[PDB]
Every structure is written in structure tokens, then in C-alpha cells.
Nucleic acid binder design. Structure first.
Ligand SMILES: [Mg+2]
Ligand SMILES: [Mg+2]
Ligand SMILES: [Mg+2]
Ligand SMILES: [Mg+2]
Ligand SMILES: [Mg+2]
Ligand SMILES: [Mg+2]
Ligand SMILES: [Mg+2]
Ligand SMILES: [Mg+2]
Ligand SMILES: [Mg+2]
Ligand SMILES: [Zn+2]
Lengths: 85, 86, 73, 162, 142, 59
RNA sequence: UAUUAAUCUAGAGUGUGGUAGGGAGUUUUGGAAUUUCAUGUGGAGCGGUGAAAUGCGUAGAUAUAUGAAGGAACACCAGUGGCGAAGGCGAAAACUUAGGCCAUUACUGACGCUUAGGCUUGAAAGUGUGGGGAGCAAAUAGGAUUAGAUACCCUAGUAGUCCACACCGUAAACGAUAGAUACUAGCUGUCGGGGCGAUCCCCUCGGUAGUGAAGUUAACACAUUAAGUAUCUCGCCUGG
């Protein structure tokens, strides 16, 4: 079994438990990964971090290094494969 | 010299709004041929017009064959008026 | 490398002239012409293909009516 | 049809070249409507064709049958006072149907005046700027498109058996 | 009242038209398809749904009663693999296939179905054997 | 191709005339041997393609 | 299924309304550039090559400036382009003319696909008659190179390349992929018609490209413009 966070551009056959989500945002990714870790943590019998929890304790911050977004650009870096004769 | 499509349709119409039958189509086709035979006879080196002329000639023959297969009596009426046989 | 703006715009399309006459925008066509009495290409002139052809025919027609030069020398 | 001649005559003197245009008008043009003429006049010439650089420019906006061209064309060369003449038949020019189309004119007018307001723009250039060299995206999509978007003609179908 | 958006056109051969539609839908995993409706196509599709390869088939008519198009769907299982495996047409235009009752074919040792329209419209091969009467053989479906 | 020297400096003059002459030179080698229409069309499309691909990665 | 007697519009056409084109023929016109000739200035080489030599030049060449004559082809535009069934089409104009795309509450009402035989067109070279001939150049002469050079190089150089009318009917005439019909992911371009109304960009209907999965192939590769899933018709293949 393999689970994955598909982002609209993945072949569904390869993954087993697809979990529609983002993958480019340092906030969505962290939230979902901890949730799966939280299931494991509850099964292992140590307190959870984000799952089955209220509003006041889930708030997280956006990492630094325009603005946190998720647009895919940088298309100019895809010219024609070097050819001609 | 040029033709007028409006006049030929009004003359060859069997009844009003019948602007797409076989009789009106073949009458228009014959008129353009007369003009087109003139043009090709004058020039003698334009072959696209010759291709168009041959294609147009073939369409009337096929159209007249169909109108012979169905309702042959109306074929007689149209042929004597238009004088296309000979 | 180099940098600049991709402003490359077809003038006549925004102004919607839709029609080119050689004695209505003569000073406009002289801009499209290069200083060497030569019709500038896409990279410089900036019009679309349709208006470039239209301006090109008009520029050559003016050059037949003997309104604009044909080459420096 | 409606033709448009752009005549060229020598730079002798204005009234006699204007007079020269009148004979060329009354002799030929077998069948013709009203021949309104303007007087671009003695403008400089791009080359000394016919050993002439100072020419009077005339434009004729007549209209008539296709026979109006032959006699005038064959007489122009013979006449030593005429340098060039071009009968630019506007029914074959690059774009003739749109100028007669009424709604097209309107949208054309439409397009020009707004782009021009952009041109006017409160303290617009900020530098030479060229006619544009400064054009923002058409904001969010032209909502008018989304509202007046045309629904095609398909068909409503009714169930019969199941 | 079912609405559509696309114009519906179809190929001329009504048995292989359906066969091409069915095979392409199977290969492309498509579910909803449309085609023009003919009584032969309706009847052959009716026995098809009785023999159990497709689920539903609804024919509709225009508001003028001049055109009819049949829109059928396939029976996919939960894991999204179809029940149809392969379709092949025998009596193509030009070469019409006529076999007597004694030479009625058996498809995949009886697992598949052979479609035969003898005299009382289209009829499956097994019931055709029961009636001891044969005729036109349209296509093999398994 | 007249361009004035302006008599303020010389270098600037040779910097512009070098460009004009190279575009002039290009056509000069083009017009020395007559090639067939197929071969001639091939070299035009090739030059455009070379310039195009260059402009693609330079833009 | 075939025959016959009829109805319908969705196939295909016609008309109206939008509309893009280097589509074709005929008749006129124009400028750069070369050659020759005319007139000046000028004074020893020019030309050609790997290096040179035939060759041109004190009879004043090359060069420079002006003019005249003539023929051929139409820089730029010109394209990650347009048109035509193909060959092909790019200086300008006039006249005649072919097809195509989009929307159709209009009309006829299966009138459609393919096509043996037949007809038409069909690059260049080649032929016959009459013109034309600036440049270029098969054949040919000379100078080089070479062991030899009937070749590659150079200097000359006829037919021909051009036009009109008659033939020839072949090409790697290639997308090495016949036409028509139905279905099958998507993405990035670009062109045309239409809708909105700043361009730009969005949507629809088409044409032309790139990338790309199922699918196909021996592989390369094709992949909605198929070499995929299927039907009709024609042409063709059966070891060297
Ligand atoms: Mg001179
Ligand atoms: Mg020849
Ligand atoms: Mg010898
Ligand atoms: Mg020589
Ligand atoms: Mg000979
Ligand atoms: Mg052959
Ligand atoms: Mg070819
Ligand atoms: Mg590919
Ligand atoms: Mg043998
Ligand atoms: Zn434009």
C-alpha cells in the first residue's frame, strides 16, 4: 500500500489511497503529514499533535524565504529540444 | 457580360420560396456554363476554370439522371424549355 | 542576458482602423518604414500579420505612387 | 462599381493643372456617376520619374461600369502632362465588406474611443511612452462576455421507452 | 426531457456502428454514449440487455417526431473493468453471411453470444437453437 | 545608407556602421550563386529557424 | 438485403447573410542590379587562385560621375505563415474567373462514397515553327592540378534558360502514409469566421503545427490531421 497527496497531475493507478490536497504550499503539506502521523501516534499510544483537536492549538505559521501562493510559472525555461541541421 | 442570379431563380421557380430545388439549381448551373464557356474560349490557358467547368457539367448530368429516376414527366417539361440536350 | 517589455502590440487593432488608405495615415506608415526606406519586420514594427500585410501593400503602393523612398545610398 | 484614381500631373502652374484634370475628366469615363475631386496639390515626389519631381496630386472618387477604365488608361500614357494614374478598385482591396457593414463600424468606433481614453489618461505618459508602451491587462474578463455569452442551438429530447 | 449539447451524427452500418461505439467506449473506459436510433439497433440492443452485457438503453424522440437517437450506458463493476471483452462483425455490407440452423455457431464454447435475426426479429443463438430455426448472423459478442 | 559621423567622435560611427554593413554583407553573399527554388527556400527557412530558436532562449 | 408504392430531414446540395486568401488566365506599368554603348576625370595594372597561369589593359583598362538601349527575375514584406486536388502560386494595377470557412426560424427531400474504361491537368529537361537574347551555362577551346584528368578550380563559350502557338506526360511528382465514413485522454502554439466589448486575453466553429496516455508496430515510431477501434470502394504486392 502507498498513499500520496495527488495535485491534479498524478496517475491514480499508481497510488492506492489518494488524498486530494496541495503539495506546493509549506502549510497544507505540513498539516496533512502531521494528521497521518497523528493516526500513527494514537495507535502507538502517545499524545496526538493535530488530529482530533480544536481551533486554538492547530494555528501554524507560514515559512519565510511574491507571498505564499501556489501558481506554477517558469515556463520560459522550456524551449525546443536542441535540434536543426 | 454578366448574369443575374435573382432573375433566373424567379423565372425558374415552380412556386415561391423554392430557391433550392433541382429545377432552379440546374437552370442556374446552365446559365453559369454559358458564361464560363465564353470565358474559357477567350482565354484557353486557364485550367482551374476548366476544372470547374468539367465539375459543373458532371453535376448537371447526375442531377438530370436523378430527376429522370423520380418523376420523369417533370424531366420532359424542364428539358424542352432549357434546351440542354444535343 | 537582456531584458525589456513584451509590449509588442498591433497598433491598428486597438484603434480598430479596420482599413488602410495611403492618403489617410501617410505619416503613420512612415513610422513603420525604417530610416533606410525599408519595411521593418515583425520584431520592430509590432503589428499583427494581417495589418502588417495591409501596411506592406499600402507601403508598396505609396512607393509606386512615388511618395516614399526605396533605399538609402 | 466605385473606383478611385490618384492622378499625377507636372508642376507647371496650379490653375492650368487643375484645368488639365478637367479635360481628362470630360473626355474618358464612358459611363460615370458624380466625379468629386480633391486637390492634394503640388507635394514633393519620391523620385524624378518622367524627369519630374514637383507634381500636383489629384484623386477621383467616381463610380461606374468596368468600361470607364480602358479609354482613360490608354490615353494617360499618350498625354505628356500626366505621370501616373492608378484606378484602385476598392471592391478588391484588403478589406471592403467591413466598411459597409454597419455593426462592424460601430464596434470599431467603440474600440477606438476607449483605447483613446486610455491614451488621454490623467497625466498619462510619465515619459515619451510611445502610443502605448504602457498597457495593463484588460482587468478581470469582460463580464459582458460571460453575460451575453450565446447558448448554441442543440435540441431538447423527450424519453419514450425505458 | 433529457438535454444534450453536441450534434448527433452516426456511421451508416448500424450493427458495426454500435460495435465501434461499444468497443471504443470499453477501451476508453467511457460510460455514456449516444447514437442515432434505428429499429434494428433498438431490437438488437434489447436482446443485448436481456443477455446482460449493457445496463440501460433509452430511446428518445424529437418534439416533431422526425428523429430518434438511442443513448446507452455500459455495466461497469465496482473496480471499473467492463463485462464486454470483444466484439466482431461478420455480415458486413457487401458480404452478407447466411448460415442454416445446423451450422449456427457456438461462441467461446457457449460463453459468448451469437446474434442471429432469423424471421421474428433478432434472437440469441441459444434460443435460436431451441426453435431449430436459423438465418442472418449479425456479429459475435463475448 | 548615409549616417552622419556628427564629428563629435569616431568610434561611435564605426560601432553603428559595423551593424549596417553586416546586414548588408549578409545579402551580398546570398546574391552570388543562383540556386534552385527548393534549395533557396530551404536556406531561408533555416536562417529564420536559427534566429527563432536563438530568440526563444534569449527571451 | 433486393423490388415497388409513398412520407421525413439528420447525409449531401441550393439561396440569403457574414468572410479569408502569393487560386488562375489576359492586358498594361515600375524600381534596384548586371551587360553594352555614349560623354567626362584619371594614369598602370585589372582579373583570377590553394598557389598561379590563360585573359583584359598606354588603342587609357579597373575605378568614378551622368545618360541611353536591352533582356531576365521581382530585396525587404517573408513567417515555430496563406491559398490550390496535385504540379504550383510572392513587384503593381485593371478585366474575367475557381474553390473554401462561419451562421442559417429558407428550399429541394438520399439527390451520397468509390470508380474499371474515358476525359482534364501535370516540375524540369527535350521537340517543331517564328521572335528574343542582359546574365548564366550542357556541348566545346584554352590555362591549371595530376602518375594520367575527357572531372573538381579558372578564362572564354553554342544549344538552352525567355515569349506565342503546337507536342513530349516523366520526377525522392514524398506526408515514401488512396478516398469516404463513425468513435477514442489531454497540453502548448498559430490562422480564419462568429460572440462580447480596450488591446491582450475568454468561448464557439474550422485550417495548419509541437508534446503526449490508453491503443498499434519487428523496432524506429503513429497517436483526434493515426500508422488506433471499424465499414464501403478503387489501385497495387507474392524471393534476389
Ligand atoms: Mg552610370
Ligand atoms: Mg521546359
Ligand atoms: Mg580540352
Ligand atoms: Mg565565364
Ligand atoms: Mg537544339
Ligand atoms: Mg513514376
Ligand atoms: Mg514536390
Ligand atoms: Mg509524436
Ligand atoms: Mg525470379
Ligand atoms: Zn492587427
Amino acid at each position: 500500500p502507498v498513499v500520496a497527496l495527488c495535485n491534479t497531475n498524478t496517475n491514480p493507478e499508481l497510488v492506492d489511497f489518494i488524498i486530494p490536497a496541495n503539495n506546493h504550499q509549506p502549510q497544507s503539506t505540513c498539516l496533512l503529514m502531521n494528521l497521518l502521523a497523528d493516526a500513527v501516534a494514537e495507535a502507538k499510544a502517545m499524545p496526538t499533535m493535530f488530529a482530533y483537536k480544536p481551533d486554538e492549538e492547530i494555528q501554524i505559521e507560514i515559512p519565510q524565504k511574491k507571498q505564499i501562493t501556489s501558481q506554477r510559472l517558469n515556463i520560459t525555461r522550456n524551449p525546443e529540444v536542441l535540434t536543426r541541421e | 457580360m454578366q448574369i443575374d442570379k435573382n432573375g433566373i431563380i424567379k423565372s425558374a421557380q415552380l412556386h415561391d420560396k423554392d430557391v433550392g430545388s433541382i429545377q432552379v439549381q440546374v437552370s442556374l448551373l446552365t446559365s453559369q456554363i454559358k458564361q464560363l464557356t465564353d470565358h474559357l474560349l477567350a482565354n484557353k490557358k486557364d485550367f482551374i476554370s476548366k476544372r470547374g467547368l468539367y465539375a459543373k457539367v458532371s453535376k448537371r448530368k447526375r442531377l438530370l439522371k436523378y430527376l429522370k429516376h423520380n418523376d420523369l414527366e417533370a424531366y420532359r417539361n424542364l428539358v424542352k424549355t432549357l434546351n440542354l440536350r444535343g | 542576458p537582456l531584458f525589456k517589455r513584451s509590449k509588442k502590440y498591433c497598433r491598428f487593432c486597438a484603434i480598430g482602423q479596420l482599413r488602410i488608405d495611403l492618403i489617410d495615415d501617410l505619416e503613420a506608415l512612415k513610422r513603420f518604414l525604417s530610416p533606410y526606406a525599408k519595411i521593418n519586420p515583425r520584431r520592430i514594427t509590432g503589428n499583427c500579420q494581417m495589418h502588417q500585410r495591409h501596411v506592406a501593400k499600402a507601403l508598396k503602393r505609396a512607393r509606386y505612387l512615388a511618395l516614399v523612398p526605396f533605399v538609402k545610398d | 462599381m466605385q473606383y478611385n484614381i490618384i492622378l499625377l500631373v507636372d508642376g507647371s502652374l496650379s490653375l492650368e493643372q487643375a484645368n488639365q484634370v478637367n479635360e481628362k475628366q470630360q473626355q474618358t469615363l464612358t459611363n460615370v456617376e458624380g466625379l468629386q475631386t480633391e486637390y492634394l496639390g503640388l507635394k514633393e515626389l519620391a523620385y524624378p520619374i518622367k524627369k519630374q519631381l514637383s507634381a500636383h496630386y489629384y484623386r477621383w472618387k467616381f463610380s461606374g461600369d468596368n468600361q470607364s477604365t480602358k479609354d482613360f488608361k490608354r490615353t494617360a500614357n499618350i498625354n505628356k502632362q500626366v505621370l501616373r494614374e492608378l484606378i484602385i478598385n476598392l471592391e478588391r482591396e484588403y478589406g471592403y465588406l467591413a466598411s459597409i457593414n454597419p455593426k462592424k463600424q460601430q464596434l470599431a468606433l467603440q474600440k477606438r474611443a476607449k483605447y483613446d481614453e486610455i491614451i488621454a489618461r490623467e497625466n498619462n505618459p510619465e515619459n515619451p511612452d510611445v502610443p502605448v508602451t504602457s498597457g495593463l491587462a484588460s482587468t478581470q474578463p469582460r463580464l459582458s462576455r460571460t453575460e451575453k455569452a450565446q447558448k448554441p442551438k442543440e435540441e431538447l429530447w423527450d424519453v419514450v421507452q425505458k | 426531457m433529457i438535454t444534450t449539447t453536441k450534434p448527433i451524427k452516426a456511421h451508416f452500418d448500424p450493427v458495426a456502428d454500435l460495435l465501434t461505439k461499444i468497443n471504443n467506449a470499453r477501451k476508453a473506459k467511457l460510460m455514456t454514449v449516444t447514437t442515432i436510433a434505428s429499429k434494428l439497433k433498438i431490437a438488437i440492443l434489447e436482446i443485448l440487455v436481456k443477455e446482460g452485457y449493457l445496463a440501460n438503453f433509452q430511446v428518445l424522440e424529437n418534439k416533431s417526431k422526425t428523429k430518434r437517437i438511442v443513448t446507452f450506458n455500459l455495466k461497469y463493476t465496482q473496480r471499473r473493468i467492463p463485462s464486454i471483452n470483444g466484439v466482431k462483425q461478420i455480415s458486413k455490407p457487401g458480404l452478407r453471411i447466411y448460415r442454416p440452423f445446423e451450422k449456427l455457431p457456438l461462441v467461446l464454447n457457449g460463453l459468448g453470444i451469437a446474434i442471429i435475426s432469423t424471421s421474428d426479429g433478432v434472437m440469441t443463438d441459444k434460443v435460436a437453437r431451441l426453435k431449430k430455426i436459423g438465418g442472418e448472423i449479425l456479429a459475435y459478442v463475448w | 545608407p548615409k549616417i552622419e559621423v556628427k564629428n563629435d567622435d569616431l568610434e561611435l560611427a564605426l560601432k553603428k556602421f559595423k551593424r549596417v554593413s553586416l546586414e548588408i554583407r549578409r545579402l551580398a553573399q546570398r546574391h552570388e550563386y543562383h540556386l534552385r527554388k527548393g534549395m533557396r527556400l530551404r536556406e531561408k527557412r533555416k536562417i529564420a529557424q536559427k534566429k527563432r530558436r536563438k530568440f526563444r532562449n534569449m527571451v
